Design a protein around this ligand. Structure first.
Ligand SMILES: *[C@@H]1O[C@H](CO)[C@@H](O[C@@H]2O[C@H](CO)[C@@H](O)[C@H](O)[C@H]2NC(C)=O)[C@H](O)[C@H]1NC(C)=O
Ligand SMILES: *[C@@H]1O[C@H](CO)[C@@H](O[C@@H]2O[C@H](CO)[C@@H](O)[C@H](O)[C@H]2NC(C)=O)[C@H](O)[C@H]1NC(C)=O
Ligand SMILES: *[C@@H]1O[C@H](CO)[C@@H](O[C@@H]2O[C@H](CO)[C@@H](O)[C@H](O)[C@H]2NC(C)=O)[C@H](O)[C@H]1NC(C)=O
Ligand SMILES: Nc1ncnc2c1ncn2[C@@H]1O[C@H](COP(=O)(O)O)[C@@H](O)[C@H]1O
Ligand SMILES: *[C@@H]1O[C@H](CO)[C@@H](O)[C@H](O)[C@H]1NC(C)=O
Ligand SMILES: *[C@@H]1O[C@H](CO)[C@@H](O)[C@H](O)[C@H]1NC(C)=O
Ligand SMILES: [Ca+2]
Ligand SMILES: [Zn+2]
Ligand SMILES: [Zn+2]
Length: 722
């Protein structure tokens, strides 16, 4: 097989292709790009089959959370396996790899792919995989093996080949096979060592034995084989470890140490919820100038990580820097480890695929492991259980896709806010001493041609659709921007505008000061008052669309209205204004103009979904105007920089941000530091996917882009990395 040339040849009985999911623990993407030619069996798979540049793991980049994510399509917060070592307060039990509690089904939520196949009339076998030797939802796979780490790889392969030799009635359609290397070697001697080379050669022989075994049965081109990893590997040093003794005079708390630390009380379960989590994060914030970790209260963590909505995830979290460690005391440190941020290049996993369903000799762009579950379902011809993968985003991997995706149906239609009179019925305690005749409101009145012109420029991919039931809203059209106004919350849900490529940075008009007026289109009962922000001293009004970004002085008046106001904390406003005044211009030059869609996010229950009106817990003092938890900024331009975003036929380039709306900038540590040294760093830290923005807002983007839904899903699941 290994010497044989590249190839739907299935023998008698095999009507449907069998699916084999092969995991090689800690096989980082870097190992494939550098050492592939030293591994002839995996190199043939790379040459003949399909492979991604890398597969993004889930945070924390550990074995049990990631392996269970691959088979469920769920984030650790939803499936429950948040770490290899964890504690549940309600169960009052400790979970570990060396404990009996790992076999308790109470810890395992969701529906793994073996159960999905079993519930839909197919048989499933497994030679190891976290959760496969556990009676998840009161059921084990048809054939499974109780975990035993030292069983030789040949014996694991031989038993799997016996299962493929079984009669059609007994023969499973889905298979899992797990291997401990090159993770074990990575921990021992580091990612770039002789130990990992030997381990990579060992896993290549194991894969070679499987492929040669399949070739004898004439199943080498029949079987839909997937070779992947749970996470990557990085180098650790005893000279690169932060100690909690250097920050606290006395440690009375419990700490889950390493690359993804979690802090809780020692007095469990009595002091669990009582524990001052907010004190720990405050006492660890900006303590040292060259601090190699950042404390976070779980709802404040970057939204793209989706690591907060679970009782097992302790409120205190530490985001450890590349190649560093965080321990309780100075009293293992050498070699290598994983568990760090999934965006780190060293944490990237491998993904290779071969079979009749997969495209041959194909290199695909990086994707996330949460997407694998839907692909496994399409391969097995089964309906997927509710998961976090975008069904259809992985269709470019298949020769003939099983599922055809469609755009999310709009649940609420736009109504009202039409121009009737240029005279305001209510002043709303707003003042602009510059206006003289106030007939500038005639510019807010746009004819069918004027509306189409701004819809062509500022809405090139179509208006974001409202995927919310009974959401009273209207579209507000202006010559420089278009917004979707939320009537009940008295602010816009989204504001879309395409800034063209600017010429010079030196000559830039400032925002018209002390000028604010009522929008004649929106009813005063559905509008914000300027007096609302005078009463509340902590929050002030902010502009969602920057008035001075487009046109002239007369164009600014179209944005100096009550409908363009959003509640903002003074400290957040410093980041918001700097981004639109300095960073946005810089980005607009780099990608030949940029389309911006901005708006508020409400996620008080930190579940990654948009809040229902009853879920919002903070409002503008003495008013029903809600306070956003986050603000989104989705930058869209074209992949081919020769075209502007408003006039482009090819693929689009996206840069989404989900920035927390916090009263302080303690996350950035900006003490005696100008905005040019921390604002961009803070925005880049809170980069997310378009899908993340979509779930947090109940909006759906790019529904009017002439491209298949499957291709638009690739753009929506894309995570920009720097
Ligand atoms: C995996 O290990 C478990 C636990 O040792 C085995 O389950 C026991 O099987 C016996 C006989 O079928 C039952 O009487 C017990 O009730 C089971 N549970 C326990 C906790 O003892 C299981 O059979 C093993 N599976 C394989 C494939 O070897
Ligand atoms: C889970 O493991 C932790 C850590 O070993 C145990 O924590 C101890 O709990 C007692 C109270 O029950 C405290 O007085 C100790 O200070 C804790 N020790 C540490 C090191 O944190 C906990 O009891 C275990 N729980 C179960 C149910 O096994
Ligand atoms: C990931 O997918 C799961 C499953 O669809 C989502 O969890 C469900 O959320 C609803 C609403 O909060 C609950 O009623 C269900 O009980 C949850 N199911 C499970 C299995 O946990 C989860 O919200 C999704 N996450 C994101 C960020 O979209
Ligand atoms: N199903 C399992 N049950 C118990 N331990 C396991 C299982 N699968 C893997 N392991 C262990 O987890 C280790 C990898 O975990 P990690 O250190 O997080 O990369 C392996 O070397 C095994 O010893
Ligand atoms: C658990 O199994 C039952 C059938 O026995 C099924 O109806 C249910 O949906 C399953 N739940 C999960 C989370 O897989
Ligand atoms: C970009 O578009 C131009 C046409 O405007 C075309 O000539 C060029 O080849 C395109 N480049 C890429 C990389 O697609
Ligand atoms: Ca929510
Ligand atoms: Zn692992
Ligand atoms: Zn490991």
């Amino acid at each position: 097989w290994v010497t044989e040339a590249c190839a739907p040849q299935c023998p008698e009985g095999f009507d449907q292709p069998p699916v084999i999911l092969f995991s090689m623990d800690g096989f980082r993407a870097e190992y494939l790009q550098t050492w592939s030619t030293l591994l002839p069996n995996i190199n043939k798979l790379k040459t003949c089959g399909l492979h991604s540049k890398y597969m993004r793991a889930v945070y924390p980049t550990k074995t049990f959370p990631n392996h269970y994510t691959i088979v469920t399509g769920l984030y650790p917060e939803s499936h429950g396996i948040i770490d290899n070592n964890m504690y549940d307060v309600y169960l009052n039990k400790n979970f570990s790899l060396s404990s009996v509690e790992k076999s308790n089904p109470a810890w395992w939520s969701g529906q793994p792919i073996w159960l999905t196949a079993m519930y839909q009339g197919l048989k499933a076998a497994s030679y190891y995989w976290p959760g496969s030797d556990v009676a998840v939802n009161g059921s084990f796979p048809n054939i499974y093996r109780n975990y035993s780490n030292s069983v030789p790889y040949e014996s694991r392969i031989a038993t799997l080949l016996q299962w493929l030799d079984l009669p059609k009635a007994e023969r499973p359609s889905f298979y899992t096979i797990y291997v401990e290397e090159p993770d074990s070697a990575g921990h021992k001697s580091g990612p770039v060592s002789a130990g990992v080379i030997k381990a990579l050669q060992l896993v290549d022989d194991a894969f070679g034995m499987l492929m040669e075994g399949l070739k004898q049965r004439n199943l080498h081109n029949c079987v839909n084989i997937i070779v992947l990893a749970d996470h990557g590997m990085d180098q650790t040093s005893c000279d690169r470890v932060e100690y909690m003794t250097d920050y606290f005079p006395e440690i009375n708390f419990y700490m889950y140490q390493g690359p993804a630390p979690r802090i809780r009380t020692r007095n469990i379960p009595q002091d669990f919820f009582t524990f001052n989590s907010e004190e720990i994060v405050r006492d660890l914030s900006c303590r040292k100038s060259d601090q190699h970790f950042k404390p976070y209260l779980t709802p404040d963590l970057p939204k793209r990580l989706h690591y907060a909505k679970n009782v097992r995830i302790d409120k205190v979290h530490l985001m450890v820097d590349r190649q560093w460690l965080a321990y309780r005391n100075k009293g293992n440190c050498e070699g290598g480890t994983h568990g760090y941020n999934n965006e780190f290049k060293s944490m990237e996993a491998i993904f290779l695929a071969h079979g009749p369903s997969f495209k041959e000799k194909t290199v695909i762009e990086p994707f996330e492991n949460i997407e694998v579950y839907n692909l496994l379902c399409d391969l097995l011809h089964i309906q997927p259980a509710p998961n976090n993968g975008s069904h259809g985003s992985l269709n470019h991997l298949l020769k003939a896709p099983f599922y055809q995706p469609s755009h999310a149906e709009e649940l609420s239609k736009s109504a009202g806010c039409g121009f009737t009179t240029p005279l305001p019925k209510d002043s709303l305690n707003c003042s602009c001493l510059a206006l003289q005749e106030e007939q500038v409101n005639q510019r807010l009145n746009l004819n069918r041609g004027e509306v189409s012109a701004t819809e062509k420029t500022n809405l090139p991919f179509g208006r974001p659709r409202v995927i919310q039931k009974n959401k009273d809203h209207c579209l507000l059209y202006h010559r420089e921007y278009v917004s979707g106004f939320g009537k009940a919350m008295k602010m816009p849900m989204w504001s879309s505008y395409t800034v063209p490529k600017p010429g010079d940075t030196s000559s830039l008009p400032p925002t018209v000061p002390d000028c604010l007026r009522a929008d004649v289109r929106v009813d005063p009962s559905e509008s914000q008052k300027c007096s609302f922000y005078l009463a509340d001293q902590n929050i002030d009004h902010g502009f969602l669309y920057p008035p001075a970004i487009k046109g002239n002085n007369e164009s600014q008046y179209d944005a100096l209205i009550t409908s363009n106001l959003v509640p903002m904390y003074k400290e957040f406003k410093k980041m918001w204004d700097y981004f639109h005044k300095v960073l946005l211009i810089k980005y607009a030059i780099e990608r030949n103009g940029v389309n911006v869609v901005s708006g508020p996010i409400f996620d008080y229950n930190y579940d990654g979904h948009f809040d229902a009106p009853d879920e919002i817990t903070n409002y503008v003092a003495g008013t029903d105007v809600p306070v956003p938890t986050h603000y989104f900024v989705v930058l869209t331009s074209c992949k081919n920089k020769t075209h502007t975003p408003d006039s482009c036929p090819g693929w689009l380039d996206v840069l989404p941000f989900v920035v927390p709306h916090r009263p302080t900038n303690v996350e950035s540590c900006p003490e005696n530091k100008a905005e040019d040294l921390w604002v961009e760093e803070r925005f880049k830290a809170h980069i997310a996917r378009v899908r993340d923005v979509e779930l947090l807002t109940g909006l759906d983007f790019y529904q009017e882009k002439t491209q298949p839904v499957s291709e638009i899903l690739q753009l929506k699941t894309y995570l920009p990395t720097f």
